[PDB]
Design a protein around this ligand. Structure first.
Ligand SMILES: [Mg+2]
Ligand SMILES: [Zn+2]
Ligand SMILES: [Zn+2]
Lengths: 196, 451, 56, 76, 98, 98, 51, 50, 388, 65, 49
DNA sequence: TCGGTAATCACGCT
DNA sequence: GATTACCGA
């Protein structure tokens, strides 16, 4: 189920780890979304990291921090309001791992970021088709999941099998798992015969 | 296996399709399994290799000072597949407590008679490599104890399946050339190198899990006197621009022969602006150390450069559009906040504040102009390359290789004798060349002489 | 006389199809095996009857 | 002063003999018409003694083999 | 009445599916433009003009001999300026000058 | 000074209505904001009060929506802090087991 | 008419003859796991019981 | 040209062949209304001008 | 140990090994001097023959499809680059994906021709003497030594004007003003204020149409050889290079000072007409290599030498689509799924034409096994078949 | 959409301490001392009182039988 | 929305840009990606017609 | 030279 | 609507 921020950090749930195996902090905090650290100093989204302090400041103070463009709350005045409410000036905190239990010799960053769920949910994508209803004109499968039809193999997908050398698979995929018809054909005229 | 598919995990779609008949199924297993495709036919180098955590985990394992205790060595050898008996031995530095080193936990995965030596991306002092190189070349097999503890952290040297000196980064894995997965598929089959890459991957993500690799907001932060070093660069580079406008305006043109006076002016101006941003990029890069977890990701190489970490506590450079500086707008003035007839730096598309110190509203609207030039060239260029591929496949899909080494068309017209300037497959050649005498000599001699 | 990669994947393909249509198996038994997997064990011991033709 | 030869782009040609046509024909089991046909224009062939219906050998070089031969024909 | 007050409005309910006209951006009718140079020929000056329906390009081109073409929609056959301008309403060459 | 001819209103309203959802939009890169203003038009969220008495082809509803923390003062004066879309997690930044 | 049924970028050389719709397939999303080998793949048990 | 496969006077259509029914299907619209095929619709109008 | 001992150990082994290999292996073996003696010399040569024998191509390969895919993959990752290159001499040569289409599709015209000019042994190191060669190549008319044309009052009708400073830094030689009389029509000689008065004592043909004389002799002046564009000089490798513009080959090679044997070109059809087909082989190969390396990403040159040695297959180079190799000889169904034109093409080969087999696109279209790959092997098997 | 009776990270009841909280912020009192006066210690409990919509009133009146 | 009647597919490198007259009338960022990428654009939040 | 006409312009999915 | 190039006086 695809989630995203409003800064552009889109992604998918990796797994769904229990509460017991969570790297937790020297307070009652147990994180929710353990975001990959390899995506923040690669996409230049510093507004993610300013908002993460702005969630921690505006939850402890009481008043929702204004954050509009060009006239909003400045950068340096936040990091003093966090520094006199009981925390280190840059978010970093002492964290204990939950599997074994010893302080990770670093200071793991942590905040409050507003995410939002998107409607590219997984139960509207998955389909399987063994043998369904076909086309009237060609006797080939249909299009779309609402009319129970499979995938279509363009001219890209025919050529990526000839590059291997697969000639047995290329017959069985394209014609044997498709329409096969048996036809009576004359010899010296070349035209089709007519059963009766 | 996600540089062949060129995928990522932000909700993509992959389709499988089962083959059925017993001839088309035993053809799929022998000719199309993954381990046959570890190197690629475009450049020889490995393609299925390590990515983002597999590189930057491997730097934390081979740093000088990576001493694991007894519980953490024994726990990780169970998790990375391998099967060894009671030999984690011999507790190499008992100085504090009986605990191992980081090199020898990596030296259980390698086969028993490797010999490779090369220099990698982290080399910041070229003189202290020299000494190591000179000794090695004259005394082919010294003792691994005495002389080899004069080692460096940027010269990988393995002998007999024992990493004496080195530091693993993106020169041993990686989507482009890494010459430690490369030299394990041409010497020790294929089926060995599917369990080198299956045990490295699970060993390396272990140490990056239980050691912490956060990257907070203070990684971009510079102290006050380093910020004032930047502002003297931006001031005099703006002064050189204000002087060069006055040289053109009073007739001190100093022209180039090829270009016109407007095109000479734009040339000189842009060079000053360009250089100014690189000179300020060197100040920040020199200052903040290689000990936070934002430059470890940039030196080794896993989603980073050293440009966009000095584009976050410094300038953002100029903001151009296909080689010209921003000029479209009103009658002689881009925005209506500037007096017209002006060619200044601050007034014609040049931002001067970071992604930390806030962009003022002329700089932000100058920044959307440069950002939309990047998004148009994704959807325009994709449709021209897609049609250009259909031309070449459908004209060239006929050509085979016969048994006597001849490439022939369907009519029997010989296209190329003795395929591809006979005759070695580029999938298995080394860097364009052929049999690789150089490597052979060193490898064969070492095993024989070493014994 | 080593086989190529195209001949090795055709000899298995023809032998896995005979081994489904009758054609009594050599010493290949244990306990349950799909007809493709029977041809893989026979090729390792070098008791394949099927030979290639090399046009030259 | 120069010619088409003595150049870093043009490889050197030579006109075959009468006995080598059938000897080349049996080495590759081909037919005479199945060879890639230089035209009677295009100065590489015209400064040699070009007769239509003949095989002319080139000795071109590649940076991954050494020297490598490649046979062609002459059509009007 | 079965609504919410935050609804802004601006959409029809033609046939039972709420359909909205999206504003198409014109190119300034009854204006005139001075078109650029050297795409196939010399400078042209294109225009649009419509009243109660039909719109049409009526351009005054020129190529590299000084013809000063005028373009008509129907039966295209590009006509010289001094053919039409004499035949339309003015006869004296002094009046075409002034 | 005595040189100007007009005076701006607030200049924090150059940008559109779903690009005024991104807090601090002068710190990010430029293609990251364009993706951000292209996904406030796709999130789930309780948008109108009459989702019960309505027949539309497919609708969505999010059980516990939340007014965001740090945001613009513009999104108070369109109505977005009365029909919002999305929740407030508490993230951490560390590399987990792969 | 006939010339547009034979042709037209979705006619009856690329549209239906040399690229066809197939049977025994599936299509869903992807999500990592670094615990299986390099040449294996996960398959859901819903797709596994309909192929 | 070829004297057994391509005579030139056969290029002028004296007899126009009719394609079969199976190449011109009859699509049903809602439940009982049949959308006539595009080839079928023009062939009906050919016969009335003949 | 010496020369004879080594050389003849490779000679014996030779017959499976190669010609290039032989020279290579010796010259490195000899170099190593902490020397190895006899048994490991035989071990190295018997190991070099095993790696060469391991790395030959399998007969039956599908070369032509994996050539088109490995050249069409790297052009999709052709994102933006540093378009603000820091050079001066080479100017505006259309880097990127639009070059790759211009080299594949023939296109007689191509935009931005830049022909590299190299110099011989007498104009190599002399700074100002190399300049006059570039002067001799460039060539200038009278229209670019102006800014506009201002008419006279009654009868002089013409004047030369701003500016004169193109003759004191490049040296376009005021003696050439005297020279102007070369094969011209009237050629009066009068320089009062530095401009040559040319009187025209005739009638109705030229009356006041100054604009048509701008296409005649006023533009027909050819002050210098090789009537092509501008020349830039760069210092590289202690030779001066002259990176000109345009393409005028058989005139450019006949210039006193250009070294004729090394001048490379950014054109395709002219190097085929002048230097021959197999030189245009090496023009196509060396040009697609230079585009790939400048953009960072590498392709191996086995794939390039399959396209280039198939595009000169019929003595005149062909384009790649709808008028070239697909439009050339094949099965008539091979031309059906490419170049959707068929009432032009499919009804043309209705007249006197057979169609056997043996493509790759036909047997997939009709239901037969294709010839490449695993449909190339032929089996045979005897039949007592006792189980035992 | 009435207040969630748990938090989303820290398991702790909250719906008894929301309608007492908001009726003491519509007198002008600062929320920084009201939430401290109740039993709210961390800031994972506290981000879900301080940001909520109480939208049950509008939807309820619209009716469906 | 403010759409623009042109061709959706052929590149318009000078008609998909971002011009100085858009200041205060058209939004600089909101542009859907696909083949359009700069042919449908949105009005700013302080304007009058 | 010089004017004229067609014929061409990703993958999948709703 | 833009590139070409082949075709036509
Ligand atoms: Mg994706
Ligand atoms: Zn018959
Ligand atoms: Zn909580």
């Amino acid at each position: 189920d695809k989630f995203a921020s409003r800064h552009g950090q889109k992604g998918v749930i990796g797994l769904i780890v229990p509460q017991e195996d969570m790297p937790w902090t020297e307070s009652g905090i147990v994180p929710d979304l353990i975001v990959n650290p390899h995506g923040i100093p690669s996409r230049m989204t510093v507004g993610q990291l300013i908002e993460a302090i702005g969630g921690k400041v505006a939850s402890l103070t009481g008043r929702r921090v204004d954050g509009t463009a060009f006239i909003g709350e400045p950068e340096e005045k936040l990091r003093k309001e966090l520094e006199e409410l009981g925390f280190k000036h840059s978010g970093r905190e002492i964290m204990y791992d939950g599997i074994t239990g010893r302080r990770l010799e670093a200071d793991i960053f942590i905040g409050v970021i507003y995410y939002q769920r998107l409607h590219h949910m997984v139960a509207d994508k998955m389909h399987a088709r063994s043998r369904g209803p076909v086309q009237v004109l060609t006797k080939q499968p249909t299009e779309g999941r609402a009319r129970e039809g499979g995938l279509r193999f363009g001219e890209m997908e025919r050529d990526v099998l000839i590059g291997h050398g697969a000639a047995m698979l290329l017959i069985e995929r394209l014609l044997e798992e498709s329409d096969k018809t048996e036809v009576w054909v004359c010899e010296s005229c070349g035209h089709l015969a007519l059963e009766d | 296996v996600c540089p062949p598919y060129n995928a990522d995990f932000d909700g993509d779609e992959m389709n499988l399709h089962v083959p059925q008949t017993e001839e088309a199924q035993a053809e799929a297993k022998i000719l199309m399994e993954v381990q046959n495709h570890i190197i690629s036919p475009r450049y020889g180098g490995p393609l299925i290799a390590g990515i983002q955590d597999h590189i930057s985990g491997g730097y934390l394992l081979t740093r000088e000072g990576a001493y694991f205790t007894r519980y953490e060595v024994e726990q990780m050898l169970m998790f990375a597949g391998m099967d060894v008996n009671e030999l984690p031995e011999p507790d190499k530095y008992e100085n504090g407590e009986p605990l191992w080193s980081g090199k020898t936990i990596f030296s259980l995965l390698l086969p028993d008679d490797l010999t490779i030596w090369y220099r990698n991306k982290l080399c910041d002092e070229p003189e202290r490599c020299e000494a190591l190189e000179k000794l090695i070349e004259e005394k082919l097999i010294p003792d691994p104890e005495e002389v080899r503890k004069l080692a460096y952290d940027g010269f990988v040297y393995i002998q007999n399946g024992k990493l004496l000196s080195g530091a693993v980064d993106k020169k041993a894995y990686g989507r482009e050339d890494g010459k430690l997965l490369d030299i394990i598929v041409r010497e020790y089959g294929v089926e060995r190198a599917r369990q080198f890459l299956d045990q490295v991957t699970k060993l390396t993500i272990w140490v990056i899990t239980h050691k912490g690799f956060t990257t907070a907001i203070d990684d971009e932060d510079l102290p006050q006197e380093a910020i004032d070093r930047i502002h003297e660069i931006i001031r005099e580079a703006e002064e050189k621009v204000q002087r060069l406008i006055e040289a053109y305006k009073r007739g001190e043109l100093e022209p180039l022969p090829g270009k016109t006076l407007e095109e000479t002016l734009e040339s000189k101006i842009m060079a000053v602006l360009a250089e100014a941003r690189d000179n300020a990029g060197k100040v920040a890069e020199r200052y903040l150390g290689m000990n936070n977890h934002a430059v470890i990701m940039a030196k080794t190489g896993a989603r980073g450069k050293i440009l966009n970490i000095t584009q976050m506590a410094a300038m953002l450079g100029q903001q151009s559009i296909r080689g010209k500086r921003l000029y479209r707008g009103y009658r002689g003035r881009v925005l209506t906040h500037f007096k017209p007839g002006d060619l200044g730096a601050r007034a014609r598309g040049f931002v001067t504040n970071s992604y930390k110190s806030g962009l003022t509203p002329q700089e932000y609207f100058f920044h959307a102009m440069g950002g939309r030039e990047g998004l148009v060239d994704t959807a325009v260029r994709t449709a021209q390359s897609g049609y250009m591929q259909r031309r070449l496949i459908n004209a060239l899909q006929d050509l085979k290789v016969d048994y006597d080494g001849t490439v022939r068309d369907p009519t029997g017209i010989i296209v190329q004798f003795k395929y591809g300037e006979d005759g070695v497959d580029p999938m298995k050649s080394w860097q364009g060349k052929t049999v690789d005498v150089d490597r052979v000599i060193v490898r064969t001699l070492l095993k024989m002489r070493g014994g | 006389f080593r086989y190529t990669r195209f001949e090795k994947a055709r000899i298995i393909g023809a032998r896995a199809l005979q081994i489904a249509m009758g054609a009594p198996v050599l010493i290949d038994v244990p306990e349950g095996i799909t007809p493709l997997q029977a041809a893989l064990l026979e090729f390792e011991k070098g008791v394949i009857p099927i030979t290639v033709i090399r046009p030259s | 002063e120069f010619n088409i030869f003595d150049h870093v782009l043009v490889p050197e040609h030579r006109i075959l003999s009468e006995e080598e046509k059938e000897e080349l024909l049996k080495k590759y089991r081909i037919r005479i018409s199945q060879l890639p046909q230089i035209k009677a224009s295009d100065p590489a062939v015209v400064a040699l003694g070009a007769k239509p219906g003949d095989v002319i050998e080139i000795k071109r070089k590649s940076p991954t083999a050494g020297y490598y031969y490649y046979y062609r024909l002459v059509v009007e | 009445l079965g609504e919410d007050p935050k609804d802004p409005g601006g959409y029809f309910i033609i046939n039972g599916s709420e359909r909205v006209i999206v504003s198409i951006e014109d190119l300034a009718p009854n204006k005139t433009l001075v078109e650029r140079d050297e795409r196939q020929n010399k400078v042209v000056a294109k225009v649009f003009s419509y009243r109660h329906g039909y719109r049409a390009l009526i351009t005054v081109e020129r190529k590299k001999d000084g013809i000063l073409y005028v373009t008509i929609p129907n039966v295209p056959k590009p006509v010289k300026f001094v053919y039409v301008m004499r035949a339309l309403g003015l006869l004296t060459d002094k009046e075409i000058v002034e | 000074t005595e040189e100007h001819t007009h005076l701006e209103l607030m200049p924090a309203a150059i940008l559109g209505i779903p690009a005024s959802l991104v807090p601090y939009p002068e710190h990010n890169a430029a293609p990251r904001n364009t993706y951000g203003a292209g996904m406030a038009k796709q999130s789930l969220g309780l948008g109108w009060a009459n989702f019960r008495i309505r027949v539309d082809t497919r609708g969505h509803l999010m059980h516990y929506p939340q007014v965001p923390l740090v945001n613009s003062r513009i999104m108070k004066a369109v109505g977005f802090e009365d029909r919002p879309a999305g929740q407030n997690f508490v993230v951490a930044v560390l590399s987990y087991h792969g | 008419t006939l010339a547009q049924r034979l042709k037209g970028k979705e006619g009856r050389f690329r549209g239906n003859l040399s690229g066809k719709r197939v049977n025994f397939s599936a299509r869903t999303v992807i999500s990592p796991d670094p615990m299986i080998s390099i040449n294996e793949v996960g398959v859901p048990l819903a797709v596994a019981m309909e192929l | 040209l070829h004297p057994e496969k391509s005579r030139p006077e056969w290029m002028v259509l004296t007899v126009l062949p009719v394609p079969p029914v199976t190449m011109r299907p009859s699509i049903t619209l809602e439940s009982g209304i049949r959308a006539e095929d595009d080839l079928t619709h023009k062939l009906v109008d050919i016969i009335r001008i003949n | 140990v010496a020369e004879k001992t080594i050389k003849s150990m490779v000679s014996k082994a030779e017959l499976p090994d190669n010609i290039k290999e032989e020279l290579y292996a010796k010259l490195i073996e000899y170099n190593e001097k902490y020397k190895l003696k006899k048994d490991e010399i035989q071990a190295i040569i018997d190991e070099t023959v095993r790696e060469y024998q391991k790395a030959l191509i399998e007969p039956g390969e599908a070369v032509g499809t994996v050539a088109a895919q490995s050249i069409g993959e790297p052009s999709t990752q052709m994102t933006l680059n540093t378009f603000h290159y820091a050079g001066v001499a080479e100017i505006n040569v259309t880097l990127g994906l639009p070059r790759i289409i211009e080299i594949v599709d023939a296109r007689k015209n191509p935009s931005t021709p830049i022909m590299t000019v190299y110099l011989d042994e007498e104009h190599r190191y002399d700074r100002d003497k190399a300049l006059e060669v570039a002067r001799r190549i460039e060539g200038t008319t009278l229209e670019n030594l102006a800014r506009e044309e201002t008419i006279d009052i009654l009868n002089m009708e013409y004047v030369v004007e701003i500016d004169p400073e193109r003759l004191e830094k490049a040296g376009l030689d005021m003696e050439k003003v005297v020279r102007k009389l070369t094969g011209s029509f009237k050629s009066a000689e009068f320089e009062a204020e530095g401009y040559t008065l040319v009187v025209r004592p005739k009638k109705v043909t030229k009356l006041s149409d100054l604009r048509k004389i701008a296409e005649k002799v006023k533009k027909h002046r050819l002050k210098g050889l090789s009537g092509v564009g501008k020349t830039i000089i760069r210092k590289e490798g202690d030779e001066y290079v002259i990176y000109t513009e345009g393409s005028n080959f058989k005139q450019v090679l006949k210039v006193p000072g250009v070294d004729p044997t090394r001048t490379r070109t950014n054109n395709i059809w002219e190097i085929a007409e002048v230097l021959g087909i197999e030189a245009a082989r090496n023009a196509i190969i060396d040009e697609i290599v230079s585009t790939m390396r400048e953009q960072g990403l590498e392709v191996d040159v086995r794939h390039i030498m399959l396209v280039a040695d198939m595009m000169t297959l019929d003595g005149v180079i062909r384009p790649i689509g709808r008028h070239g190799i697909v439009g050339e000889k094949a099965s008539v169904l091979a031309r059906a799924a490419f170049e959707i034109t068929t009432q032009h093409l499919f009804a043309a080969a209705e007249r006197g034409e057979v169609d056997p087999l043996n493509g790759v696109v036909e047997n997939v279209l009709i239901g037969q096994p294709v010839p490449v790959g695993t449909g190339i092997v032929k089996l045979a098997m005897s039949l007592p078949l006792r189980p035992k | 959409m009435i207040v969630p009776v748990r938090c989303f990270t820290c398991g702790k009841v909250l719906a008894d301490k929301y309608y007492e909280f908001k009726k003491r912020v519509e007198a002008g009192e600062d929320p920084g001392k009201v939430l401290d006066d109740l039993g709210v210690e961390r800031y994972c409990c506290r981000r879900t009182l301080l940001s909520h919509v109480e939208l049950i009133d509008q939807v309820m009146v619209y009716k469906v039988y | 929305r403010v759409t623009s009647p042109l061709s959706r597919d052929q590149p318009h490198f000078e008609a998909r840009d971002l011009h100085g007259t858009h200041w205060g009338r058209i939004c600089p960022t909101e542009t859907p990606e696909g083949p359009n990428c700069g042919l449908v654009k949105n009005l700013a939040l302080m304007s009058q017609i």
